[PDB]
Amino acid sequence: MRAFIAIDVNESVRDSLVRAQDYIGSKEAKIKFVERENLHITLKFLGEITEEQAEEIKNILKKIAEKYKKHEVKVKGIGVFPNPNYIRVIWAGIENDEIIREMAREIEDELAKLGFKKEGNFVAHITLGRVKFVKDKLGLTMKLKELANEDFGSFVVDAIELKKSTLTPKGPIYETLARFELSE
């Protein structure tokens, strides 16, 4: 349905971010939280693509992944988007994201050859939930400020993946179409 490219986290990180979501909870704001299996770093959103574009993209990603070496990154810090006053999305940041950034820029340049728009201004993050509305602004800002530079854990950037999300009556389901290991 809608395809995108991502980097998955590991179980240790997933567990720590889920506990952080619980700690935020729903008392200071109504938040639709990301399900545990869907916590990941998005490198590029593709939209609806044909099977032929998908095949072509899988070939390109295979070659891109083999140019980068597996490396360990730390998930650190809570960020808000678009801005502290006005909170729409709560994210976790990545420490040492430069190689991820480099990959996402290389992806955007190659897929540009296939007609996909370069979106630029990439920021490596893991979305933790989307704020429907804030109930207690002060309380929410207080809880987010305590988390601002929090060390949530580390994981090895192992592969880039091509995934897709499909809306079904029971909500969106995500699938992994292909996975491309970075160089050891």
132-135's contacts with Cβ under 8 Å and 24+ in sequence apart are 132/29, 132/30, 132/31, 132/32, 133/29, 133/30, 134/28, 134/29, 134/30, 134/87, 135/27, 135/28, 135/29, 135/30
125 is catalytic: yes
Please pick, among 14, 44, 76, 125, the residue that the annotation labels catalytic. Answer: 125
* Active-site option among 24, 29, 34, 40: 40
Sequence-ordered list of residues with C-beta below 8 angstroms from that of 113, at least 6 positions apart, any chain: none
Active site residues: 40, 125
